[PDB]
Design a binder for this molecule. Structure first.
Ligand SMILES: NC(=O)c1ccc[n+]([C@@H]2O[C@H](COP(=O)([O-])OP(=O)(O)OC[C@H]3O[C@@H](n4cnc5c(N)ncnc54)[C@H](O)[C@@H]3O)[C@@H](O)[C@H]2O)c1
Ligand SMILES: NC(=O)c1ccc[n+]([C@@H]2O[C@H](COP(=O)([O-])OP(=O)(O)OC[C@H]3O[C@@H](n4cnc5c(N)ncnc54)[C@H](O)[C@@H]3O)[C@@H](O)[C@H]2O)c1
Ligand SMILES: NC(=O)c1ccc[n+]([C@@H]2O[C@H](COP(=O)([O-])OP(=O)(O)OC[C@H]3O[C@@H](n4cnc5c(N)ncnc54)[C@H](O)[C@@H]3O)[C@@H](O)[C@H]2O)c1
Ligand SMILES: NC(=O)c1ccc[n+]([C@@H]2O[C@H](COP(=O)([O-])OP(=O)(O)OC[C@H]3O[C@@H](n4cnc5c(N)ncnc54)[C@H](O)[C@@H]3O)[C@@H](O)[C@H]2O)c1
Ligand SMILES: CCc1ccc(Oc2ccccc2)c(O)c1
Ligand SMILES: CCc1ccc(Oc2ccccc2)c(O)c1
Ligand SMILES: CCc1ccc(Oc2ccccc2)c(O)c1
Ligand SMILES: CCc1ccc(Oc2ccccc2)c(O)c1
Lengths: 257, 257, 257, 257
């Protein structure tokens, strides 16, 4: 496969609907060796089952709010892997009120802080902690959304955080690029996941993209997963600092008229 | 003038080189009534002199890190003005190490938090606190930089914060737009100000833009000020959610080759 | 006014609904001296009346399909004005089938050629013919549409031509910038004009922008006109190579969901 | 391979330095069956050798300036293939003076017409002629350049044509998307090819991208080829209307300062 021998750490695999699950499946298919993170003790058994499905027992806790856990993640991983070839950041969070209704109604300093801390800061934070063990041709991938680019109803504070995340892709690409490391995002179309269900009226977004995207269909975690596997691979060695849309072309139209 | 009768509050007027000074001068010329904020007791006398230069004694302290001071700002202003027609957010801050050298070297959770808190969150925070007194045709203006759009050497963590700021312009425009309120940014070219001098190798950016911009010259606070006055006025009643470049066209080229 | 003494040539003033009419009205208000072009002998009397309304008898024929008429335009204008300070290109055309229904159904080599010739090439063509008489601080303005940036139903071949037009703004800005000349576009929201009525289902676009723009209202030729007058003036001396949206913020959202 | 069974027609394979050669090599590796076009009788033997290298004798003349040759191309191809799964448009041309020196100096109506006819119109023209034989999951790919997005020295008239080309990707994606067909571009970094050598000071662009791109290296036809093969494949079934940069991240920075 086109990821033969590549060692890839995946965050964010919460359920079999997770974007990270689709990425994991595609990476394993293409020959990668995988490792996984989780948050919260009650999820240890579930993530362990997922890891086993992908031929791995490499599972580590990491709440990205916590500097100590970020450092311990890579210390733990290093006991197994001398080097890391891929990193998938598939992590986002905002308090419920910050992704519902009017943008200002749900804006507080703490809601802003938390959304940006978990959804944006954590990506370059993981990159920095990983750097001593990154291979020279390593590839780092995050997940963003069109809400970064244009105002989407209810997405609100997450739109600000995704914009900062996409900027971090560019600044990371410069910082890490001379070494040879690539950094990219996929701006995924709407997919029904646990996180997605936190956005007020997500169902309306899903239906609108199905009706108005050029391909007249929503994307799947398999499609995002394949795009992800591509970006993580040497097939994409010419590509860095890129935000690739995998959204059935929806970003490129003015729909619904 | 084209701002006759308009009541405009300006933040960020630190010295006569400040972008806010240029905006103040243009607004006063076009007939606006002005009020000003400052941070730090040692600046009270200086900002009072500036206010007097622009025919006003309306000066208020506001450290945008502090929720209480934000609320007290508008309570104080309200004792003078029943309504507010314009708001100029000309405020940015990042710790020194976060705007020098390598992006990851200067990245910490706290540096990230502070840069985003002061440079991005504070804009919609002021908008929310101002809303009860905003006139229906009020106009809110912030200042951004090209570092939001593309990676610029040393700008680093501020690039992430400006990207979030530009997203906030769009989400603010939606929140406030039905009332009739407009929200925009100017993405200014490099100007030698106190804040600018915090960026490592700012002089190199200044010289490069002078040599490679389409107009082969750097912008001035007078030029940014006039663009600002325009956006704050009813001349611009068709314009919202816009990030207007005032940078001699530099953003639009690939220079230096 | 902020255009005192400025001599500005306006193309495209077909009726009192034309975008160019709004620009003319704003420019005259701000003190400019105006001159006008027209196409087709039956329009001589109408454009002459418009010119008189704006205090001018300077009217010249110019079909931009014709190199000879472009050259004769500036030779004629030069008999009156030693120098030209502003140029408004408010000209677009595509064959009916190229702006209706499916994009490929209406695509032919000739439809493509004509749409790009009249709608895109003509702008830098006028700039080149005008250059010997342009003042050093002259300002050139064209009108574009969001269809350049994203696919809009029915806009079709005009979307390609507007994309080329917006690129021409950038290349013109570089060519003319060292002299001091500025070049910009306004990307206007939908306005019911004669040209607009050629687009299939224009009414649907108009209604959608009214309902989904941040300001919940369509723009007027007065709003576009004021933005235009600003860009043509020394107020905008810091601005070149810019495509400014004047569309009630519509470009910045994902609406209709 | 990930293109097993896919039948792909490639235009533009002129020499072993051509971008199309890199795409051909990657597609063959991944299991595709290939067919090729050429222009000019003196090239028949050369393109036939290339086709043989990729296990094919399917070679057809097509000058995209000529409607009859475009129609005869697909009639000829149809005698061999019932359906077409991929189309690679790797074709660009502008008269020498239109890609050298000052933008206006090299602008004529005919230079404009020719550059847009061959470099932009020809892509949707091929798509339209191919449509009756396109499979439902076919993928169409064109090659663009950063000169579409920002002004690059000497690229001049080609910048306008590439902007129109990128718009055509979006309008094609909408037209063909309901059927299931995807349409994308790769915006490639500078590569020394025969066409590239027509651009004045191409060597300077090549050197600048090597020094200032995030990866500090120029891209190769192998890297562009792999990205191309990906986009042509079912791996990319979630991706349409996309302009993917394969340029070592150069587009994403402000370099040379
Ligand atoms: N589902 C969509 O439509 C969609 C579209 C575009 C982008 N995205 C993005 O994709 C990414 C993945 O989300 P998803 O849609 O697969 O939903 P998901 O709920 O399956 O995954 C979200 C993950 O974020 C993790 N997370 C939250 N807080 C964390 C913390 N403090 N530390 C570590 N991990 C934490 C969760 O544990 C979870 O695994 C997110 O960044 C999301 O913003 C999703
Ligand atoms: N000078 C440039 O080249 C340039 C270019 C683009 C954008 N900008 C932006 O313009 C804005 C103004 O900066 P400037 O260049 O005029 O420099 P400046 O130093 O004159 O102004 C910066 C202002 O930020 C204020 N500020 C910092 N922390 C604050 C806080 N906690 N509470 C309230 N105010 C605070 C400072 O007091 C100061 O008045 C900034 O947002 C800056 O990012 C500047
Ligand atoms: N009305 C809108 O919603 C809208 C929105 C965005 C952009 N625009 C653009 O604004 C510009 C003006 O159009 P309008 O909406 O004011 O409609 P309009 O019909 O009033 O003006 C169009 C003008 O194009 C001129 N024209 C056409 N072919 C010409 C030729 N061969 N030579 C010289 N002039 C020629 C017409 O004479 C007419 O004056 C156009 O470029 C149009 O694309 C319009
Ligand atoms: N080389 C680069 O740096 C670079 C970067 C970005 C984009 N591109 C684009 O990639 C594409 C391929 O060019 P290349 O760099 O591989 O150089 P190339 O010279 O190898 O290929 C150009 C091809 O265009 C074909 N062509 C020209 N006129 C034609 C016509 N009338 N009919 C049919 N074919 C015609 C030529 O025959 C040739 O095969 C072009 O569109 C070019 O603009 C090149
Ligand atoms: C509408 C598409 C979409 C769905 C889910 C997402 O993940 C989230 C959402 C909110 C908070 C945290 C993560 C996301 O970013 C975008
Ligand atoms: C290079 C142009 C530029 C100069 C000054 C700025 O203001 C700052 C800079 C750093 C931290 C806080 C504010 C800015 O944003 C951009
Ligand atoms: C939908 C807004 C809009 C309306 C009118 C326009 O002018 C045209 C339209 C078609 C052909 C020529 C000029 C235009 O460009 C955009
Ligand atoms: C600088 C990168 C680059 C090199 C070659 C290209 O192909 C051309 C160039 C000019 C005319 C026609 C095709 C191109 O488009 C872009």
């Amino acid at each position: 496969g086109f990821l033969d021998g590549k060692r890839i750490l995946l965050t964010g695999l919460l359920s079999n609907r997770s974007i990270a699950y689709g990425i994991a499946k595609a990476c394993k298919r293409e020959g990668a060796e995988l490792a996984f993170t989780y948050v919260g003790d009650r999820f240890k058994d579930r993530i362990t089952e997922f890891a086993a499905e992908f031929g791995s027992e490499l599972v580590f806790p990491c709440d990205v709010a916590d500097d100590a856990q970020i450092d311990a993640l890579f210390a733990s991983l290093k006991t197994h892997w001398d080097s890391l070839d891929g990193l998938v950041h598939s992590i986002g969070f905002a308090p419920r009120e910050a992704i519902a209704g009017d943008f200002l109604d749900g804006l507080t300093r703490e809601n802003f802080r938390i959304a940006h801390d978990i959804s944006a800061y954590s990506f370059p934070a993981l990159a920095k902690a990983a750097l001593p063990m990154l291979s020279d041709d390593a590839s780092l991938l995050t997940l963003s959304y069109l809400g970064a680019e244009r105002a989407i109803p209810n997405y609100n504070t997450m739109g600000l955080a995704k914009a900062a995340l996409e900027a971090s892709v560019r600044y990371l690409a410069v910082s890490l690029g001379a070494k040879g490391v690539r950094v990219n995002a996929i701006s995924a179309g709407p997919i029904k996941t646990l996180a997605a269900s936190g956005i007020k009226s997500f169902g309306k977004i899903l239906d609108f993209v199905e009706s108005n995207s050029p391909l007249k269909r929503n994307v799947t975690i398999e499609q995002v997963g394949n795009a992800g596997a591509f970006l993580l691979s040497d097939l994409a060695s010419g590509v860095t600092a890129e935000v690739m849309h995998v959204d059935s072309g929806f970003n490129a139209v003015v729909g619904g008229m």
